[PDB]
Amino acid sequence: DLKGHSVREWVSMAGPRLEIHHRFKNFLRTHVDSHGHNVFKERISDMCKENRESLVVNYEDLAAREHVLAYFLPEAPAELLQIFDEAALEVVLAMYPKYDRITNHIHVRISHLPLVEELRSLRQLHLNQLIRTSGVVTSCTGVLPQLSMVKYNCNKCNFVLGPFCQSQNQEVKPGSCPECQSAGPFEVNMEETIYQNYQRIRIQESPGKVAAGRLPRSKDAILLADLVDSCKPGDEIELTGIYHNNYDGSLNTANGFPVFATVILANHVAKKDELTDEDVKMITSLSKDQQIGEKIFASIAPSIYGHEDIKRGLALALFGGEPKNPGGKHKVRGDINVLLCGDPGTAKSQFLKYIEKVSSRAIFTTGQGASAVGLTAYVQRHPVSREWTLEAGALVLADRGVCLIDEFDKMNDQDRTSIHEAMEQQSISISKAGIVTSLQARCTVIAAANPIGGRYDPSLTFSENVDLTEPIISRFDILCVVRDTVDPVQDEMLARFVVGSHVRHHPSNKGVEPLPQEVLKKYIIYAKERVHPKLNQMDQDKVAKMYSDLRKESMATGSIPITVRHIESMIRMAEAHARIHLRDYVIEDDVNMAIRVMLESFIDTQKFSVMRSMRKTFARYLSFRRDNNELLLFILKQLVAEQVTYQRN
């Protein structure tokens, strides 16, 4: 239909306007599919059923069926899109006549626009055109209510004025009221006015796409009444919208050039990136595998070789225990805090990052200030929103999740106090400006740290070769002492692992089976939300005798003793292990495994001599579920290492 003088003026005329209207209606009715007969039929049906008041329209099919309309679309998006909305409204009414009571309007969204540009490539030539870009949302305000159909109220004669439709370009100015013909001030009439949601976001170039010697560019976009809340800061989004320019933006103010600000009137948003059913069958299907414990323990941080015990501890921490407060006066936490202390170059931060990735409501912070959110609460005006807000500490943000703390031994005094408070009383008390409040932070703390001097020395007990006071360490349920000891076989294996990773992740090329990560987190969700094991089958006799023996042995030597909190931690870990298997009743094997883990941690926290003392004295407990091959391999490795040391000295 190429004809005339101006594209926008061509659509402006009533003739082609109605021609396009009816052609688009016929396209909606007739364009069916290759095989999905009348996609728009079920589309509109679903939209009306959920009351979505929107219609995403692919550009490819619209161009195929009606090439003229698709060509006209990007040149003058406003008029074509308004016509499409008008057409779709009556199409919906024909399909759903009663739906006319709902929103009295339908929005048309267009997706898969062929030509996609970048924020740095925007030019004046793109003014007033439908354009598709990609970017990261760097800021987003609240859902501000914007005037849609105002009804100003004349003061002198108290007569409400008719609906003056609000334009996104200019603020509406009322004339003189028809009744008393007064051009007075007038005021909005909120009760009779109708509004529309108005959100303002900023979209910046993806850092992975910016060139070497260039900085990312940003553009402001306006989401209106249905795209609101479709984005959050940090989202990678494909945005299709109108590169609008003419609202009020012109630096006519002194000391200013005739520049024009630009905002993208958003028309479609697509984020480029868990309440299911019948997956309970899936989770239960492998829950009865009878060896799922090994599978899950091997399915943690698959990019980290070895460190199986650390992976087991992290699994137990993930599934968690059972918080219980007998009466209301004995608060016992159901969490399993974990501390990984080890010499550098052992992938502790890798474990913390994996937990960040795999666990919902999981936040990451560092002892240094290099983390986005700090450990301590405070109140201030947020730098980007300029609004006075109570910045709760990181621990609070992970109220029911996981807080990962890297560089646990490099915190501030106030950071140490805050972590102590959170770990002890499971809450934070703020009295900073005038906010005398106490908000609870029931987080599981997974911490990573290096030993004093950069190397862990087994000749010294754990509590003394770490820059942490005894009270802090006393609140961790598992202590993992990661040691980097020279071992040719393990060194070769790890070298092969990492070098193969490097090979496989080159830009050009871009004893059980671990569960897929998505299914692993589904399993974690279901177990952590549904099964609540009760320890009605624990053998009090065995636990009591074990505790008494450990007390006697630890006090027989000048070593850190065993205390009640160790029994508490063993109970929590047994409950967590039961939760992994969804037993709903802690079983003898669960208790034995929890004892194994707790004794391993407690023994490894001891000095070198006491290490062997307690190993030999309690080897039976520490060998539970540890087959003969593992112990034999460990002993052979010890013997050959002794031989090597004798050789090379």
């Binding site: 740095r120 030019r123 004046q124 060139a211 070497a212 010697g213 260039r214 900085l215 002194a254 000391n255 050039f257 990019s303 990052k353 994996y354 990735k357 990773s501 490097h502 992740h505 080159h506 830009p507 871009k510």
Partner: protein
């Protein structure tokens, strides 16, 4: 916004900055930190009424002050070059012992310290950055540190690399 070059700075004076203005086509040819030559016209912009004027440069073209190539992917860079430049580059690529030649040429005035020269050369080249399936970023740029007694030509290595 630009500022005066170091060579032009008179004794004991801060650099001068005059905000140049770019228009269509040549609207992003200059990036922060680049040494650029701007060709155009000096103009006055106003900042009963008062005539307060400020000088501002309006540039009709922007080009690098010291062009690298006389003429981003490997082939694109290759075509960016002239015939003679590519002849030189290909010749040195086939030049056996190019390692020592680069070491000597890059640091002619620094005696010995072959290891540090090799380190900074490999630094100038660097590794290959990579991205993991989980999204982890594999660092592909090598850093270097130099520690030792004074007058060991450390700041000289830094200045060589900078210049």
């Amino acid at each position: 916004r630009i500022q005066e070059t170091q060579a032009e700075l008179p004794r004991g004076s801060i650099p001068r900055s005059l905000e140049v203005i770019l228009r269509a086509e040549a609207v992003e040819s200059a990036q922060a930190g680049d040494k650029c030559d701007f060709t155009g016209t000096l103009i006055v912009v106003p900042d009963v009424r008062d005539l307060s004027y400020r000088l501002v440069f309006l540039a009709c073209c922007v080009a690098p002050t010291n062009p690298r190539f006389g003429g981003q992917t490997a082939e694109s860079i290759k075509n960016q070059m002239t015939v003679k430049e590519w002849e030189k580059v290909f010749e040195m690529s086939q030049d056996k012992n190019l390692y020592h030649n680069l070491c000597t040429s890059l640091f002619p005035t620094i005696h010995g310290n072959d290891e540090v020269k090799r380190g900074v050369l490999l630094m100038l080249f660097g590794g290959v950055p990579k991205t993991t399936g989980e999204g982890t970023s594999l660092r592909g740029d090598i850093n270097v540190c130099i520690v030792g007694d004074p007058s060991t030509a450390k700041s000289q290595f830094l200045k060589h690399v900078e210049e």
